[PDB]
Amino acid sequence: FRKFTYRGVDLDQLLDMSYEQLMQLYSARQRRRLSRGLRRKQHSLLKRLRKAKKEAPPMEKPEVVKTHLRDMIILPEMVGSMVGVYNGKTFNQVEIKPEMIGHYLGEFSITYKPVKHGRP
């Protein structure tokens, strides 16, 4: 029930505010990726992924597009999505939160099983 904000501004403003100030809103590591240049040397799949998140289904559960990417910086443009990133074998499904922003998608997916121990 509590309102959500990111450094004093609200999610409608986040979808209203653009990249040249999203760099100063975000941290130094995130903005260094944004300030490196165009997303076309290798990030053509990133461009088609933001298009595939820009296409809008009607009011139901959000569309499922599995991905082979773990170095994605998640943006406010595709919050509330339905996505599973590649883990080497399968796809871990995580519903996109509004506090989900600011991190990596491959950070939020577990890859190795937690280690159990029986008898040596």
Partner 1 sequence: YKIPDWFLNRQKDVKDGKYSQVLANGLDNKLREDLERLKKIRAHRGLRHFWGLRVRGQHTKTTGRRGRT
Partner RNA sequence: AGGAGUGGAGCCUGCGGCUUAAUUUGACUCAACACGGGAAACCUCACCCGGCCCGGACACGGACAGGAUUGACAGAUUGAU
Partner RNA sequence: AGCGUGUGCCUACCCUACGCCGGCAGGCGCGGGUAACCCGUUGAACCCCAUUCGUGAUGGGGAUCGGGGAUUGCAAUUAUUCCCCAUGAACGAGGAAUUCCCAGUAAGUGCGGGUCAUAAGCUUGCGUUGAUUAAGUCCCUGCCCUUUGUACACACCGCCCGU
Binding residue count for partner 1, defined by CB under 8 A: 15
The reply on whether position 6 binds RNA by CB under 7 A is no
* Backbone φ and ψ of 101, nearest 5°: -70, 165
Binding residue count for RNA, defined by CB under 7 A: 38
Q: Which does 119 bind (CB under 5 to 8 A by kind): partner 1, RNA, none?
A: RNA
Distance from C-alpha of 86 to C-alpha of 49, rounded to nearest angstrom = 14
Report 48-107 residues binding partner 1 (CB under 8 A): 94, 97, 99-100, 102-103, 107
Exactly one of 114, 116, 118, 119 binds partner 1 (CB under 8 A); that residue is 114
Q: Which does 43 bind (CB under 5 to 8 A by kind): partner 1, RNA, none?
A: RNA
Distance from C-alpha of 85 to C-alpha of 92, rounded to nearest angstrom = 6
**DSSP annotation string for 13-77:** HHHHS-HHHHHHHS-HHHHHHHTT--TTSSTHHHHHHHHHHHS---SSSPPB--BS-S-PBP-GG
Q: Which does 70 bind (CB under 5 to 8 A by kind): RNA, partner 1, none?
A: RNA
Q: Which residue's CB is nearer to RNA, number 66 or number 97?
A: 66
